[PDB]
Write a protein that binds this ligand. Structure first.
Ligand code: Z79
Ligand code: CA
Ligand code: CA
Ligand code: CA
Ligand code: ZN
Ligand code: ZN
Length: 159
């Protein structure tokens, strides 16, 4: 496992998130389910408790965007970069973005939103790319690996 430069971590247990907008590809409940389920993957093996917000600035702002979208890492159309997220911190830090030129699916016939979001939320909680592993930098009965659990626990702690 690997962490971000300067070992950044959330300095609180209660974290908030907001889904700012939605992909055309799925219904909103399917997006909510994938994201909500993506947060539980990490919530289950840490003392972190997530809460949802509909107004205002949440810690983890979740949005779908294409090309240039307000940060130093513009998306690249279909394929290549599917999504990116930021390390723990204020502002853009902690936020997760999804490239809406990909075809986001409930299943595997396109790009699975749940799997990518789980990997993206890993970035939101301070995990960088692994060497084996959900945090491995390539998209390919799902379970969180020991290498993944090592990083989040040796940072926040166990439940
Ligand atoms: C399923 O987990 C992922 C998520 C995204 C990607 S990727 O978009 O191809 N690489 C960018 C990346 O590392 N985002 O966090 C690769 C694997
Ligand atoms: Ca943020
Ligand atoms: Ca892309
Ligand atoms: Ca799309
Ligand atoms: Zn972005
Ligand atoms: Zn990644």
């Amino acid at each position: 496992f690997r962490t971000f430069p300067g070992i950044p971590k959330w300095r609180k247990t209660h974290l908030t998130y907001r889904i700012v907008n939605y992909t055309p590809d799925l219904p909103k409940d399917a997006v909510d389910s994938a994201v909500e389920k993506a947060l539980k993957v990490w919530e289950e093996v840490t003392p972190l408790t997530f809460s949802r917000l509909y107004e205002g600035e949440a810690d983890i702002m979740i949005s779908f965007a294409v090309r240039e979208h307000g940060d130093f890492y513009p998306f690249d159309g279909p394929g290549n970069v599917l999504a990116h997220a930021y390390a723990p911190g204020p502002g853009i830090n902690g936020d997760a973005h999804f490239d809406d030129d990909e075809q986001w699916t409930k299943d595997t016939t396109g790009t699975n939103l749940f799997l990518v979001a789980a990997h993206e939320i890993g970035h939101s909680l301070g995990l960088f790319h692994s060497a084996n592993a959900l945090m491995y930098p390539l998209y390919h009965r799902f379970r969180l690996s020991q290498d993944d659990i090592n990083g989040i626990q040796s940072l926040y702690g166990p439940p």
